[PDB]
Amino acid sequence: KPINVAIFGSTGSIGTNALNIIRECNKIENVFNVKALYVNKSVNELYEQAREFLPEYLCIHDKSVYEELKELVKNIKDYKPIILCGDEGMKEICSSNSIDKIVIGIDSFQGLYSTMYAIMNNKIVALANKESIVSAGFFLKKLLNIHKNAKIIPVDSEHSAIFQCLDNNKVLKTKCLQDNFSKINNINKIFLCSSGGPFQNLTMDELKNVTSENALKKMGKKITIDSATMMNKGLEVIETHFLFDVDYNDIEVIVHKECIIHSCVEFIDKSVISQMYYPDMQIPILYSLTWPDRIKTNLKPLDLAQVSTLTFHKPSLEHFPCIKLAYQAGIKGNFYPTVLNASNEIANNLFLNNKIKYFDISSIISQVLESFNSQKVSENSEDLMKQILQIHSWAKDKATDIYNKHN
Amino acid sequence: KPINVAIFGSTGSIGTNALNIIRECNKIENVFNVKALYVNKSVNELYEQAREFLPEYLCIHDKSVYEELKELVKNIKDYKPIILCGDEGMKEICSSNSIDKIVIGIDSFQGLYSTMYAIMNNKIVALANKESIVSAGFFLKKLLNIHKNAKIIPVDSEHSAIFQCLDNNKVLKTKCLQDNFSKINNINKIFLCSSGGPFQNLTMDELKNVTSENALKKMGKKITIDSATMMNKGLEVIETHFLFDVDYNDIEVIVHKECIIHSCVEFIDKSVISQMYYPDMQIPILYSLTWPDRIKTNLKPLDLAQVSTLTFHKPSLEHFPCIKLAYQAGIKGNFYPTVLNASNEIANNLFLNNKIKYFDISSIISQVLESFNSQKVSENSEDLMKQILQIHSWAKDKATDIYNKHN
Ligand SMILES: NC(=O)C1=CN([C@@H]2O[C@H](COP(=O)(O)OP(=O)(O)OC[C@H]3O[C@@H](n4cnc5c(N)ncnc54)[C@H](OP(=O)(O)O)[C@@H]3O)[C@@H](O)[C@H]2O)C=CC1
Ligand SMILES: NC(=O)C1=CN([C@@H]2O[C@H](COP(=O)(O)OP(=O)(O)OC[C@H]3O[C@@H](n4cnc5c(N)ncnc54)[C@H](OP(=O)(O)O)[C@@H]3O)[C@@H](O)[C@H]2O)C=CC1
Ligand SMILES: COc1ccc(CCCN(O)C(=O)CC[C@@H](c2ccccc2)P(=O)(O)O)cc1
Ligand SMILES: COc1ccc(CCCN(O)C(=O)CC[C@@H](c2ccccc2)P(=O)(O)O)cc1
Ligand SMILES: [Ca+2]
Ligand SMILES: [Ca+2]
Ligand SMILES: [Ca+2]
Ligand SMILES: [Mn+2]
Ligand SMILES: [Mn+2]
């Protein structure tokens, strides 16, 4: 029972965490075969990985460094990998019969495209990219209803925590992103845990003047800023709603600054189940690849006595207005989540580059949401994807226009 | 469609909690049918229950209140119960084709007899009585191996918590008290949570002086004293071992004074899952009857932000020597757990009645354990049962002898 896995975005944070936990687990017993790796342009990192894992497939997106990889790879003896390029490369990896599971560690809005081909090929897709679920949830749901054997397994830490709390005899009667997922699993309510980010004790007057420096002073810049505004958590609320079909009024954000309890599920009997560990991405990634089983790791065991104290408080929506906007957009439904995500892409980047202030982020997003009008949701998958792209591009331009008008 | 249930010990704390959650679940649909109620001698309280629930069977252990019962039940119109007595009645109830699940809320070693008969009739046994598991664990395992369709479902709060944390997809491939349970469920280690009892923060000098009045001043007296000495947790360690096939070195007692996290399971990947709620017996009791499903309750939702802080520490074995005794007795195996439980029954009662001091409890138990000589374990059921009873009585008399010698 070898687990055959492809890694998409294998030089990124997700991709490399995945290779690390695979490496360590394989030292205990040989359970994983890394069949394919795919990166943007990091051709020197890719070579190093390839030497180690000897995957059947390699792929780089950027055509420009295609030949240079072929060069690099000659050195490796014993080894005749299939070396591919761009979207046809990804498409060929997703169609191979020797690949069971695909880790999607490609960032931003980009990664949706590989997700789609993975589903079309009825794979198990370990999806870390929350923005794809928030922007294109409707399209994913439609795709997953066509391709009955395809499944998304969540890797975002809180969503993995929720999923780990479930009974798999009930999970296997449904799958993530299905209507009625929460009803089948007897889910009542979610506690979506947050770190709270750096700005959790600041007053309004202090927040008025915080800068991106304050936010960044250990993750990518975009998610770090989102953690600071708590728009990360707002996006995660929508992610929860789509993944697990939990109503917005049944998702509660709670600030847990110790980051040991990763999230909790309240069932209809009011029993609550939670997943706990040190702050970590190895277990979420591993779980996505072993589900519905678990395997041995040599990770450090949680020492609860040493951790000693766990704390929980409600976030202030006045201080973190991005959370409110995320609920508002989610409850409105339609393509409002697409608009939220896109406008936040812009506002985040503006704040990062010192072009706007903290409360301008939510102000711009709010104004874009107000200017959107709900659209007839295409019944046809292809039209639906085009609608999402159009609306995403519209909302980005609109956020930019609001910035330029005031500025 | 309805689940047909018997309640043994219906007038006690477990029994009345069971009837309360049943009452609420049956408001609109007929979810449960209460087929039988059994008590020792509380014939007035039993009458009151019979009037409300109209069970097919009533049973009193104490035959000296039979006539009183028959007289009370006359006052209920159109109600023709089968009114039984003692062991014979218990055995007839267990034999009825019309009963699916039996809640055992009878206290002390005496709970074993009804548990045994329920198993022998291939029933689902919602077992709250821990003393039966501690005293007769190896015997129940044997019985469960013979009676293939019988199941013990744990009701003790922490063990219910553990059971809930497990994946039912794996649980359904085994059953409690079965060899290999922990392997099939990928269990690594158990965090067994405790309230710590009223004496948790006392110094050694203060602890020397404690009295039963201090421990009592809200549950039955025996278990309240065991909570104060932490012999309750020691018993629960042995209960964990047997129910879940977890090695003693992989059970860690943790004092959680807020009593929200009810216990935790660490799986082989080092992910930890926990169950949490307000301190409660309705969820454990209901879950035992609905497993592997859950049903809606109107219990107050956990308000984690209001609870605000959860703490964890290791208990001092110098202060709570009963814990250490239980681990020693459990690791030694054979009939040492039987001896532990029986000597504790006496030592607890002496303390309750102001005849001995706190440290004399552990002293008596230790001396009885040291005094016991290991016996070859009978290979047949009936002989093993007789052996257990013999050793139980022996250990009680020895505890009493030790007490009498030193005063
Ligand atoms: N890791 C974490 O802790 C968390 C991650 N996430 C989610 O994870 C997602 C992935 O981000 P993360 O891994 O953290 O970030 P990174 O920026 O580190 O990941 C980028 C990776 O994707 C590759 N890539 C980018 N574009 C392409 C393309 N067109 N074709 C092929 N490969 C491409 C990059 O290749 P190259 O090296 O060549 O640039 C690199 O391997 C995000 O959407 C985020 O929401 C969510 C919560 C926390
Ligand atoms: N209380 C709790 O929340 C918890 C309890 N438990 C376990 O559950 C068990 C019961 O505890 P609890 O309910 O507090 O105990 P109680 O003292 O409250 O109740 C005991 C019950 O058993 C009945 N009974 C006693 N002897 C017999 C007999 N020979 N035949 C039939 N019925 C009998 C009593 O009848 P009568 O009224 O006639 O005396 C009463 O109904 C114990 O083993 C305890 O460890 C474990 C964890 C939690
Ligand atoms: C050393 O760097 C690492 C930090 C963290 C992690 C785990 C990934 C957490 N994750 O799912 C996120 O979505 C990131 C933002 C959230 C978070 C959660 C937990 C801890 C910190 C931040 P927030 O609640 O929105 O603030 C891994 C490595
Ligand atoms: C109103 O009705 C109710 C009755 C009962 C309970 C909870 C039963 C908990 N239980 O399983 C026991 O074994 C009791 C003793 C232990 C405990 C645990 C949690 C809280 C207090 C004490 P300890 O850790 O040994 O001290 C809750 C409510
Ligand atoms: Ca009488
Ligand atoms: Ca479970
Ligand atoms: Ca072990
Ligand atoms: Mn997250
Ligand atoms: Mn208990």
Q: How far apart are CA B49 and CA B67, in angstroms?
A: 17
Which DSSP symbol is given to A313? B
**The domain that contains A131 carries what CATH number?**
3.40.50.720
Q: What is the CATH number of the domain that holds A381?
A: 1.10.1740.10
Domain with B381 in it: 317-407
- Residue A7 corresponds to which tokens in the numbers above? 């890694």
Ligand 4 centre from B253 Cα, in Å?
A: 15
Q: Which residues contact A303 (CB under 8 A, 6 or more apart)?
A: none
> Cα separation of A327 and A320, whole Å?
12
Q: Which residue type does A270 have?
A: K
In sequence order, what are the residues at sequence separation of 6 or more whose Cβ sits closer than 8 angstroms to the Cβ of residue B119? B125, B140, B143, B144, B147, B150, B152
Contact A305 B294 (CB under 8 A): no
Q: Closest residue of B to A292, CA-based?
A: B169
CA distances (Å), A362 to each of A272, A357, B222, in order?
Answer: 33, 10, 59
Task: Tell me how the structure was determined.
Answer: X-ray
| Domain end position, chosen among B255, B281, B316 | B316
> One-letter amino acid identity for A223?
I
Helix, strand or coil for residue B360? helix
Is A258 found in the same domain as A187?
yes
Rg (CA), chain A: 21
Dihedral of alpha carbons A222, A198, A363, A233, sign: positive
For B127-138, b/e burial (b = at least 16 CB within 10 A) is: bbbbbbbbbbbb
Compute CA distances A15 → A99, A279, B327, B339, whole Å: 16, 18, 45, 56
Query: Which residues have C-beta within 8 Å of that of residue B151, sequence separation ≥ 6?
Result: B124, B125, B144, B175, B176
Same domain? A290 vs A302: yes
- Beta strand B124-127 with A101-104: parallel, antiparallel or unpaired? unpaired
Peptide bond just before A292 cis, omega within 30 deg: yes
List CB contacts of A62: < 8 A, sequence separation 6 or more.
Answer: A40, A41
Do the Cβ atoms of B352 and B345 come closer than 8 Å? no
Q: Domain end: B156, B178, B195, which one? A: B156
Same domain, A185 and A119: no
Answer yes or no: do A371 and A391 share one domain. Answer: yes
The whole-angstrom distance between A147's CA and the closest CA on chain B is 24
Interatomic CA distance for residues A299 and A277, integer angstroms: 10
Residues A201 and A287 in one domain: yes
CA distance A166 to B166: 9
Query: Do B36 and B174 have their domain in common?
Result: no
> CA-nearest residue of chain A to B297?
A269
Contacts of A99 (CB under 8 A, 6+ apart): A4, A5, A6, A35, A36, A93, A123
Residues of chain B neighbouring A302 (CB-CB closer than 8 A): 266, 270, 272
Of A282, A284, A301, A303, residue with least CA distance to A25: A282
Spatial distance between the Cα atoms of B58 and B71, rounded to a whole number of angstroms: 13
Closest CA to B100 of B149, B58, B141, B161: B149
Closest CA to B238 of B329, B319, B318, B157: B329
Q: Do residue B274 and residue B321 come from a single domain?
A: no
Q: Ligand 1 mean position to A285 CA, how many Å?
A: 14
* Chain-centre distance for alpha carbon B250: 21
Cβ–Cβ contact B378 with A under 8 A: no
Considering only the beta carbons, identify the residue of A169, A266, A275 that sits closest to B271: A275
What's CA B149's distance to the chain center, in Å?
A: 21
Residues of chain B found within 8 Å of residue A189, distances taken between Cβ atoms: 301
Bridge-based pairing of strands A272-276 and B272-276 is: antiparallel
Q: Is residue A234 located within the same domain as residue A119? A: no
Residue B157, ligand 4, Cβ within 6 A: yes
Using left for φ > 0, alpha for ψ between -120 and 50, and beta otherwise, residue B23 falls in alpha
- How many whole angstroms separate alpha carbon B313 and alpha carbon B232? 17
DSSP assignment of A204-223? HHHHHH--HHHHH----HHH
Instruction: Yes or no: say if A286 and A25 are a contact pair by the CB < 8 Å rule.
Output: yes
Report how far residue A194's alpha carbon sits from residue A356's, in angstroms, rounded to the nearest whole number: 25
Test B297 with A268 for CB contact under 8 angstroms: yes
- The residue type found at B117 is Y
Query: H or E stretch including A345?
Result: helix A336-352
Report how far residue A83's alpha carbon sits from residue A171's, in angstroms, rounded to the nearest whole number. Answer: 37
Please report where in the chains the tokens 């553990």 appear, as a residue.
B162
Chain B residues within an 8 Å CB radius of A282: none
Contact assignment for A274 to B269 by CB distance below 8 Å: no
Q: Are strands B151-154 and A251-255 parallel, antiparallel or unpaired?
A: unpaired
Best CA proximity match to A124, nearest among A156, A162, A94, A146: A94
β pairing state of B272-276 and B261-267: antiparallel
Q: What would the two tokens of residue B143 be? A: 């019985």
Q: Supply angle C-alpha A331, A337, A338, rounded to 5.
A: 155
Residues 274-293 of B with CB under 8 A from A: 274-277, 283, 286-287, 290, 292-293
Residue A1 burial (10 A CB sphere; 0-12, 13-18, 19+): exposed
Rg of chain B over all Cα atoms, to the nearest angstrom: 21
Structure tokens at A90: 């990804």
Contact B346, B400 (CB under 8 A): yes
The residue among A163, A326, A352 whose CA lies nearest residue A232 is A326
In terms of domains, do B321 and B375 share one? yes
Token output for A318 = 């006045």
Per-residue tokens: B315: 């208990």
How many independent structural domains does chain B possess? 3
Q: Is there a contact between A41 and A10 (Cβ–Cβ < 8 Å)?
A: no
Amino acid letter, residue A167? D
Residue of B14, B134, B192 best suited for mutating to test ligand 2, as the one with most atoms within 8 Å of CB: B14
DSSP string of B21-90, one letter each residue: HHHHHTSSS--EEEEEEEESS-HHHHHHHHHHH--SEEEES-GGGHHHHHHHHHTSTT---EEEEHHHHH
Alpha-carbon distance values, A107 to A104, A131, A323, B61, B261 (Å): 9, 8, 22, 69, 36
Question: Is the bond into B292 cis (omega within 30 degrees of 0)?
Answer: yes
Range list of H helices, B372-407: 381-405
Token pair 């560690």 in the structure block, residue: A105
Q: Are residues B385 and B286 in the same domain?
A: no
Do A152 and A181 lie in one domain? The reply is: no
CA distance A220 to A87: 25
Task: Give B5's strand partners.
Answer: B34, B101
Q: Are strands A151-154 and A124-127 parallel, antiparallel or unpaired?
A: parallel
- Say how far apart CA A81 and CA A95 lie, in whole Å: 17
For chain A, first and last CA: distance in Å? 60
Which stretches of B128-278 are DSSP H helices?
Answer: 130-146, 157-165, 168-171, 181-184, 204-207, 212-216, 221-229, 231-244
Q: Are residues B149 and B172 in the same domain?
A: no
Chain A residues inside the 8 Å CB shell of B294: 186, 267-269, 271
Rounded distance between C-alpha atoms, residue A244 and residue A161, angstroms: 12
Which residues from A are below 8 Å from B268, CB to CB? 294-297
Alpha-carbon distance of A348 to B239, in angstroms, equals 54
Ligand index nearest the alpha carbon of residue B231: 4
Q: By C-alpha distance, which of A195, A193, A191, A190 is closest to A258?
A: A195
- CB of B341 within 8 A of CB of B109? yes
Q: Which one, of A96, A128, A93, lies nearest residue A112 by Cα?
A: A128
CA distance B212 to B228: 9
Q: With contact defined as beta carbons under 8 Å apart, do A95 and A108 qualify? A: no
Residues with Cβ within 8 Å of residue A373, at least 6 apart in sequence: none
Rounded distance between C-alpha atoms, residue A276 and residue A272, angstroms: 13
**Element (DSSP H or E) covering residue B255:** strand B251-255
Residues 6+ apart with CB under 8 A from A385: A116, A136, A139
Give chain B's length.
407
Place of tokens 């695909």: A102
The answer to whether the bond into A154 is cis (omega within 30° of 0) is no
Q: Does A168 touch chain B (CB under 8 A)?
A: yes
Q: Hey, are the CB atoms on B305 and A254 less than 8 Å from each other?
A: yes
Please give the helix or strand (H or E) that residue A251 lies within, else none. Answer: strand A251-255
Q: Are A202 and A310 in contact (CB under 8 A)?
A: no
Question: In Å, how far from its chain's centre is CA A401?
Answer: 28
**Which tokens hold the place of A244?**
């697990």
Q: Is A122 exposed, middle or buried (0-12, 13-18, 19+ CB in 10 A)?
A: middle
Chain B: closest CA distance from residue A311 (Å): 5
> What is the spatial distance between Cα A258 and Cα B361, in angstroms, rounded to a whole number?
40
Residue A273: which of B268, B275, B296 has the nearest Cβ? B275
Q: What b/e string do you get for B104-125 counting C-beta neighbours within 10 Å, with b at 16 or more? A: bbbbebebbbbbbbbbbbebbb
- Cα–Cα distance for residue pair B13/B327, rounded to 1 Å: 28
The pair of three-digit structure tokens given for residue B332, joined into one six-digit string: 């030694």
The token pair that represents B151 in the structure block: 């199941």
Residue B329 and residue B339 in contact, taking contact as beta carbons nearer than 8 Å: yes
* Resolution of the experimental structure, in angstroms: 1.8
What's the helix, strand, coil split of chain A in %, to 5?
Answer: 50, 15, 35
Q: What is the DSSP letter of B313?
A: B
Q: Which residue of B has its CA nearest to A276?
A: B272
Which residue type does A56 have?
E
Domain ends where: B132, B156, B180? Answer: B156
d(CA B265, CA B275): 9
Please, which residues bridge with residue A104 across strands? A8, A127
CA A252 to chain centre: 19
What burial class does residue A226 get, using C-beta atoms within 10 Å of its C-beta: 0-12 exposed, 13-18 middle, 19+ buried? buried
Measured from the alpha carbon of residue B246, the closest ligand is 7
A290, closest residue in chain B (CA to CA): B269
Protein residues whose CB sits closer than 6 Å to any atom of ligand 1: A 9-15, 38-42, 61, 105-107, 110, 128-131, 156, 219-220, 223, 281
